[PDB]
Amino acid sequence: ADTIVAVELDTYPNTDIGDPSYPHIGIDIKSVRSKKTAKWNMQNGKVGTAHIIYNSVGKRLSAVVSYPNGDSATVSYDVDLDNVLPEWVRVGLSASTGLYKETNTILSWSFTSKLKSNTNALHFMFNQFSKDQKDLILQGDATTGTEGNLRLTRVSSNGSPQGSSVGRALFYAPVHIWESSAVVASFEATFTFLIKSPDSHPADGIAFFISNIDSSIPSGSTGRLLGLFPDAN
Amino acid sequence: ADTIVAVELDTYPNTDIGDPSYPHIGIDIKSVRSKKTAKWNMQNGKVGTAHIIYNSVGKRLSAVVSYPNGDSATVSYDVDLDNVLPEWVRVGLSASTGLYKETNTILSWSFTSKLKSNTNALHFMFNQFSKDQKDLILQGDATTGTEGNLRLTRVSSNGSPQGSSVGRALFYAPVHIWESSAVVASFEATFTFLIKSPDSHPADGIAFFISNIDSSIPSGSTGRLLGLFPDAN
Amino acid sequence: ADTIVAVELDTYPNTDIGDPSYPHIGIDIKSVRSKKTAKWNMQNGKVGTAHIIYNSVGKRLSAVVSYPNGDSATVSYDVDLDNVLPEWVRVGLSASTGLYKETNTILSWSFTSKLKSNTNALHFMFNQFSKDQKDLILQGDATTGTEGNLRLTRVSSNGSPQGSSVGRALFYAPVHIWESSAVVASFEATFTFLIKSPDSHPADGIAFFISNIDSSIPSGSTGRLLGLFPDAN
Amino acid sequence: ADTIVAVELDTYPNTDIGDPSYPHIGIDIKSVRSKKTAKWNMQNGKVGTAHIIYNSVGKRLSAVVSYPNGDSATVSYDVDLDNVLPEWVRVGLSASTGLYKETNTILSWSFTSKLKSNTNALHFMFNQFSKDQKDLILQGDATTGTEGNLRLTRVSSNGSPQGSSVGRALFYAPVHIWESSAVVASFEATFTFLIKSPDSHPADGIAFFISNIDSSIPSGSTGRLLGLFPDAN
Numbered sequence: 001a002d003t004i005v006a007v008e009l010d011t012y013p014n015t016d017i018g019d020p021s022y023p024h025i026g027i028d029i030k031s032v033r034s035k036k037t038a039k040w041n042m043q044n045g046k047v048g049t050a051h052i053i054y055n056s057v058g059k060r061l062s063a064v065v066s067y068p069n070g071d072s073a074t075v076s077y078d079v080d081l082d083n084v085l086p087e088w089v090r091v092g093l094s095a096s097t098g099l100y101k102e103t104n105t106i107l108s109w110s111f112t113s114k115l116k117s118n119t120n121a122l123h124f125m126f127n128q129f130s131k132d133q134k135d136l137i138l139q140g141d142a143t144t145g146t147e148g149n150l151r152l153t154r155v156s157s158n159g160s161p162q163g164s165s166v167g168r169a170l171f172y173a174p175v176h177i178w179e180s181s182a183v184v185a186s187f188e189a190t191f192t193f194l195i196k197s198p199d200s201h202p203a204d205g206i207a208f209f210i211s212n213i214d215s216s217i218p219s220g221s222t223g224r225l226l227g228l229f230p231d232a233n
Numbered sequence: 234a235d236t237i238v239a240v241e242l243d244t245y246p247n248t249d250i251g252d253p254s255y256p257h258i259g260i261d262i263k264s265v266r267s268k269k270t271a272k273w274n275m276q277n278g279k280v281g282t283a284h285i286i287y288n289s290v291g292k293r294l295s296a297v298v299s300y301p302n303g304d305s306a307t308v309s310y311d312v313d314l315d316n317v318l319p320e321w322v323r324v325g326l327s328a329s330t331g332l333y334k335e336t337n338t339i340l341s342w343s344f345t346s347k348l349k350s351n352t353n354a355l356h357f358m359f360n361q362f363s364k365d366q367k368d369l370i371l372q373g374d375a376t377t378g379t380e381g382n383l384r385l386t387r388v389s390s391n392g393s394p395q396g397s398s399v400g401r402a403l404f405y406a407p408v409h410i411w412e413s414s415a416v417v418a419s420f421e422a423t424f425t426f427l428i429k430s431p432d433s434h435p436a437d438g439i440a441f442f443i444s445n446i447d448s449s450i451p452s453g454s455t456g457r458l459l460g461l462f463p464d465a466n
Numbered sequence: 467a468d469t470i471v472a473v474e475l476d477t478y479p480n481t482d483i484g485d486p487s488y489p490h491i492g493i494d495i496k497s498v499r500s501k502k503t504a505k506w507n508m509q510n511g512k513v514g515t516a517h518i519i520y521n522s523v524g525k526r527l528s529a530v531v532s533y534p535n536g537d538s539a540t541v542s543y544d545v546d547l548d549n550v551l552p553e554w555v556r557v558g559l560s561a562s563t564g565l566y567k568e569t570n571t572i573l574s575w576s577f578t579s580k581l582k583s584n585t586n587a588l589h590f591m592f593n594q595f596s597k598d599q600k601d602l603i604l605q606g607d608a609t610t611g612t613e614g615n616l617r618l619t620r621v622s623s624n625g626s627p628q629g630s631s632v633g634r635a636l637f638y639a640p641v642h643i644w645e646s647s648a649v650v651a652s653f654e655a656t657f658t659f660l661i662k663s664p665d666s667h668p669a670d671g672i673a674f675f676i677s678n679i680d681s682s683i684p685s686g687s688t689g690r691l692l693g694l695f696p697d698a699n
Numbered sequence: 700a701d702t703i704v705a706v707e708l709d710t711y712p713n714t715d716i717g718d719p720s721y722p723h724i725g726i727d728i729k730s731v732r733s734k735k736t737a738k739w740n741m742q743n744g745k746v747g748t749a750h751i752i753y754n755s756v757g758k759r760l761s762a763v764v765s766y767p768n769g770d771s772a773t774v775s776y777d778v779d780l781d782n783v784l785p786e787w788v789r790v791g792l793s794a795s796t797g798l799y800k801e802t803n804t805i806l807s808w809s810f811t812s813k814l815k816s817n818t819n820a821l822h823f824m825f826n827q828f829s830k831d832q833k834d835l836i837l838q839g840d841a842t843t844g845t846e847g848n849l850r851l852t853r854v855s856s857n858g859s860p861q862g863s864s865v866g867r868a869l870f871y872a873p874v875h876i877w878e879s880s881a882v883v884a885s886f887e888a889t890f891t892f893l894i895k896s897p898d899s900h901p902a903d904g905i906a907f908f909i910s911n912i913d914s915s916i917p918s919g920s921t922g923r924l925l926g927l928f929p930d931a932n
């Protein structure tokens with residue numbers, strides 16, 4: 001039912017559903033089988049940053065994920081998002097653990113959407129999330145804590161990522177991400193994250209996603225479905 | 234019930250409830266009887282611009298309303314808004330006609346809210362409103378048209394401001410307008426408007442306002458209550 | 467000597483040096499023979515808008531030029547600008563008339579450059595230029611007038627574009643347009659222009675360009691060299 | 700000769716020239732004897748943040764300096780800066796040691812200037828300074844290092860603040876800080892700093908300042924003159 005576009009930070013290779021056999025970042029257009037991926041060295045316990053960039057001129061959706069040591073992974077995909085997304089969307093962040101697990105801590109998240117004609121703009125920046133974050137819609141296991149973080153997946157009292165968890169935070173306001181009369185419709189989103197695991201292998205990752213506004217966590221979408229898709233089609 | 238802070242562009246002098254005997258801009262803190270006003274020459278049928286500026290450092294809320302010929306009216310009031318507003322608010326625009334009437338056309342509206350610590354930010358800009366504006370909450374008579382305008386009060390098919398009308402548009406997302414740990418909590422809001430009247434005297438004006446998030450149009454708040462207050466206390 | 471990257475709004479087809487046989491927008495990398503162009507219907511006497519967008523992730527430089535009736539022309543080119551431009555640049559606007567002529571009036575110009583690490587940012591917006599614009603470097607025939615415009619090419623007292631004219635306005639501050647440790651280095655530039663001609667055919671166009679900081683108008687670079695190149699190589 | 704407006708972070712009480720007998724932040728209008736000050740607990744070796752905020756509506760210039768533990772000091776002064784500053788200015792940061800000394804390390808500096816009519820804007824952000832910072836004008840002892848810092852006063856190879864030092868960094872581009880037709884002319888500037896001393900008492904402080912564009916370090920303006928004034932008048 002939901003239309004999803006997403007950038008996934010995919011920590012766990014689900015080879016039987018498309019993933020490459022490494023941790024990877026992915027552009028996902030209406031399917032968890034990414035249209036495009038890049039090998040990504042997730043750095044356990046380090047604070048990472050994702051940048052997602054799209055404009056309707058170049059019609060190239062790009063993401064880059066880096067860490068402070070400067071290793072960074074980048075992915076791009078040429079796609080006309082006007083053809084994919086409804087005019088109004090919500091934007092958000094999504095995370096999963098499955099059998100294997102990890103902290104899916106967002107430390108900051110920012111987003112800018114513009115429509116420039118022949119301008120409407122939405123921008124939010126969160127560098128600190130709060131306990132009762134009234135412009136965020138939390139779903140599933142996502143919590144904002146007093147440590148100023150967005151914890152997208154269940155952590156246990158004593159600091160531990162719980163498995164089978166799925167959580168999302170959508171910004172409260174619909175965003176008008178395209179308008180057929182706009183000459184430029186662009187969006188940028190940036191988030192920093194801390195994936196930490198003690199697990200044999202971390203899983204399952206974090207995605208920034210854009211969806212129809214009424215979007216919600218799909219049924220059994222934990223683990224490899226990254227809280228975005230009802231299935232692996 | 235609602236806590237209101239507002240800048241009013243008050244086209245019609247309701248002297249029996251505080252107004253001065255001229256059209257005026259006003260800062261309103263929890264009462265339609267402005268704490269501070271300035272004589273304002275509303276220019277009939279011309280596009281005007283309001284700017285509202287507040288920061289928690291100076292703790293001075295200011296507005297200036299100007300037109301293109303450069304006549305402008307300005308008002309300031311020293312007030313600690315942390316003491317007035319709940320932490321989370323909605324922001325919006327409100328308009329009224331009563332016995333006398335006017336177009337209450339908003340052509341653009343922009344808003345920036347920041348919390349800077351020892352940053353969270355929301356910014357929206359509308360330069361064009363659309364028929365189905367999913368990040369706006371319209372109340373009462375407010376409509377967004379295909380002419381890209383926000384028509385806060387009922388206009389009649391043939392271009393005429395109807396009386397007894399009250400309408401508001403709140404931005405969809407709550408805004409976090411103060412946070413006791415922020416060192417600067419500031420907001421700016423800007424809107425352009427076109428008040429046009431054929432009436433013996435225009436009424437009643439436009440306000441930018443900030444309220445509790447669940448705020449709605451008070452009972453019988455048309456005319457001089459500018460769609461903000463249940464009474465004239 | 468100068469390294470140029472530019473988006474040209476090329477009103478006059480110089481077929482013997484690469485142009486297509488129509489008015490065109492072009493991406494120019496170190497040569498006036500554009501790497502990529504798109505047919506552009508210049509609308510005589512109408513206010514146009516150019517948007518130039520680049521980020522080091524997608525590594526796609528794009529421009530779109532539109533007018534209010536919504537006709538718009540778009541061009542994109544995949545290029546790694548880190549390989550082309552020195553780290554510090556100036557940004558600007560350039561215009562030419564030759565044998566044929568036109569007003570090369572810039573009504574507004576804005577620019578945003580960011581370096582985001584694993585942020586530095588410059589943004590300027592001019593919606594009104596002034597007589598003595600101390601953050602602009604004017605070259606050749608470019609003048610800022612009291613009408614708030616940037617007139618890149620000589621106009622005659624009585625409203626007429628003079629021929630053989632070349633003029634540029636560079637923003638005063640060097641911009642740091644790439645930094646090998648930045649994970650995103652992006653820039654956007656936007657300008658509105660009014661090309662007006664009574665001439666048999668308008669010429670020669672407007673470019674937004676990025677150059678080494680000490681860049682100046684090349685010798686005899688009027689007409690088809692758009693004030694950017696010493697020759698047509 | 701120079702016209703200065705400044706916010707001083709004054710670490711050393713020069714009581715014989717106006718200072719209070721504590722470390723203080725100060726608003727300085729054309730004189731080092733601040734028009735207004737507030738006791739400021741400089742936290743030795745900690746990273747501090749200054750915010751300076753002015754708009755021509757409220758006509759209140761404010762600064763707040765805080766540290767991470769949240770102690771913050773605030774100062775405001777009602778002043779019409781149109782009456783004080785020339786239309787075009789440069790903006791910058793200034794520091795001094797005298798007999799007593801301190802590191803005057805700027806870790807980031809940002810500035811936004813707007814003119815809104817009846818908009819021109821300049822914004823720069825430096826979160827990382829570089830060795831050869833081509834949009835900064837360094838004066839006296841100010842150096843940008845490879846550690847990404849702006850070191851306004853001489854530090855010695857082995858980490859030590861040298862005395863008698865004075866250094867400033869002005870942004871390269873003049874800023875148009877007022878325009879008599881603007882209805883709002885506002886500016887915000889933000890900088891983080893690290894003042895560290897081993898000295899019996901730290902001195903002399905950091906100022907953000909705005910000056911005529913050709914401004915330079917006054918003769919013998921080390922120590923208590925904070926690199927802004929030729930004398931203590």
Ligand SMILES: OC[C@H]1O[C@@H](O)[C@H](O)[C@@H]1O
Binds near residue numbers: 099202203
């Ligand atoms: O449901 C099995 C899935 O759970 C994840 O945590 C594992 O890594 C695997 O993708």
Ligand SMILES: OC[C@H]1O[C@@H](O)[C@H](O)[C@@H]1O
Binds near residue numbers: 247330334437455
């Ligand atoms: O209800 C009477 C009120 O209606 C307004 O339109 C008049 O100007 C007056 O304030």
Ligand SMILES: OC[C@H]1O[C@@H](O)[C@H](O)[C@@H]1O
Binds near residue numbers: 565567688
């Ligand atoms: O120098 C000849 C050139 O001058 C331009 O104005 C003409 O259109 C042609 O490109």
Ligand SMILES: OC[C@H]1O[C@@H](O)[C@H](O)[C@@H]1O
Binds near residue numbers: 713796799800923
């Ligand atoms: O020149 C004497 C001054 O030098 C400063 O470092 C001292 O604190 C005092 O203000």
Ligand SMILES: [Ca+2]
Binds near residue numbers: 011012014019204224
């Ligand atoms: Ca996977």
Ligand SMILES: [Ca+2]
Binds near residue numbers: 243246247252437457
């Ligand atoms: Ca009234």
Ligand SMILES: [Ca+2]
Binds near residue numbers: 476477478480670
């Ligand atoms: Ca040509």
Ligand SMILES: [Ca+2]
Binds near residue numbers: 712
């Ligand atoms: Ca002192």
Ligand SMILES: [Mn+2]
Binds near residue numbers: 019024026
């Ligand atoms: Mn995947």
Ligand SMILES: [Mn+2]
Binds near residue numbers: 252253
């Ligand atoms: Mn009133």
Ligand SMILES: [Mn+2]
Binds near residue numbers: 485486492498
């Ligand atoms: Mn060409």
Ligand SMILES: [Mn+2]
Binds near residue numbers: 707709719723
């Ligand atoms: Mn002092």
